[PDB]
């Protein structure tokens, strides 16, 4: 009946949801922009944005807490060094979702999600 | 008499001095203001049409904005109507507040209840669930039989089946009024009223007295 319930089940079990959101949070950190499904991009803001807020305070406890999540030392190194102080004045909202057409294989609504600097 | 229109904001309890806790529902009743007074000469029946709350100017449409401008009142959200009970008269533009309930002891709270969506017959009509085992093939929460045979040859109108449950106008009668607080625009009624927190209520005195 779903009243005031949050979180998309996304046709997976809970171990798959925690695993794949652990994967596309690290790739959103690595490339700073990815293409994904639009329901999967709205649920990625509830994962990668607490990881950026965890990077505001460089501490050994926070770097291990952000290693218990994302399980990748290259992600813990791009946070706290290149994303913590870079977003240190932004009071939340570090991502942006832009809808991009429909996928050719299954007619899935797609979205780009990127960190809001991307200054090249 | 006439009723008032409030808003259900949560439940809490009142601890009385002699130990007894009473579960109340906090209805926030702001100052209802009359937008149209109806007469027997123009409408065939006498009633008043009040509004309450507030609405944004870009969301009030030009037909209903002129209806509030004729009364000269602020554009609130929603419009309700109460039949005048033969001994009270109201003027257009009058502001009615919750201190009308200061001598009322029992009320009838009408609300729109919580919506359960598509509900089965076990939840909707309290049908008895068939047995979980001892042979039972795919028929646990099914309704079972729905009619008799060739001689009726049909299902009867009003047969209890599955479908939409809730999201519906429900009135709960004879609720004790615990406290009328005109300064905080509050009305505490003993018990539970229909609806979720934040929904419109129509509180009027109990006709069953």
């Amino acid at each position: 009946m779903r009243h005031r319930k949050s979180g998309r089940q996304l046709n997976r079990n809970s171990s798959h949801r925690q695993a794949m959101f652990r994967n596309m949070a690290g790739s959103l950190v690595r490339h700073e922009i990815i293409k994904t499904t639009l329901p999967k991009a709205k649920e990625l803001r509830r994962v990668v944005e607490p990881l950026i807020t965890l990077a505001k305070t460089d501490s050994v406890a926070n770097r291990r807490l952000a290693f218990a999540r994302t399980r990748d030392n290259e992600i813990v190194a791009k946070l706290f060094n290149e994303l913590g102080p870079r977003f240190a004045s932004r009071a939340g909202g570090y991502t942006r979702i832009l809808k991009c057409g429909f996928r050719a294989g299954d007619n899935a609504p797609m979205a780009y999600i990127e960190l809001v600097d991307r200054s090249e | 008499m006439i009723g008032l229109v409030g808003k259900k904001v949560g439940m809490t309890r009142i601890f009385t001095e002699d130990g007894v806790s009473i579960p109340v529902t906090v209805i926030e009743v702001e100052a209802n203001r009359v937008t149209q007074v109806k007469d027997l000469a123009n409408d065939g029946y006498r009633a008043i049409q009040v509004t309450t709350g507030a609405k944004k100017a870009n969301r009030v449409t030009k037909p209903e904005a002129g209806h509030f401008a004729k009364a000269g009142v602020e554009a609130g959200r929603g419009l309700w109507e109460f039949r005048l009970a033969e001994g009270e008269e109201f003027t257009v533009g009058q502001s009615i507040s919750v201190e009308l309930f200061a001598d009322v002891k029992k009320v009838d709270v009408t609300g729109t209840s919580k919506g359960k969506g598509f509900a089965g017959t076990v939840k909707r009509w309290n049908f008895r669930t068939q047995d979980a085992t001892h042979g039972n093939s795919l028929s646990h929460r099914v309704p079972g039989s729905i009619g008799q045979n060739q001689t009726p040859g049909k299902v009867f109108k009003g047969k209890k089946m599955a479908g939409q449950m809730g999201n519906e106008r429900v009135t709960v009668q004879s609720l004790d009024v615990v406290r009328v607080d005109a300064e905080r625009n509050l009305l505490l009624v003993k018990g539970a009223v229909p609806g979720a927190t934040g929904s419109d209520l129509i509180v009027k005195p109990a006709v069953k007295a």
Binding site: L98, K99, C100, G101, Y112, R118, E120 | -
Partner: protein
């Protein structure tokens, strides 16, 4: 479970009256570039509200 007479072509024509597709009727234009797109969708070149967002 199964039909007892066959339905007419008149009957499947009336069932298919809601099968009919609807068009979009909401093609926009970009602020600077001028490309047609959906509302709240980026263009084929990669603009959204007059800003080359995709760099690709």
């Amino acid at each position: 479970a199964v039909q007892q007479n066959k339905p007419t072509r008149s009957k499947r024509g009336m069932r298919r009256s809601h099968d009919a597709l609807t068009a979009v009727t909401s093609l926009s234009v970009d602020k600077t570039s001028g490309e047609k797109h959906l509302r709240h969708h980026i263009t084929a070149d990669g603009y959204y509200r007059g800003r080359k967002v995709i760099a690709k």
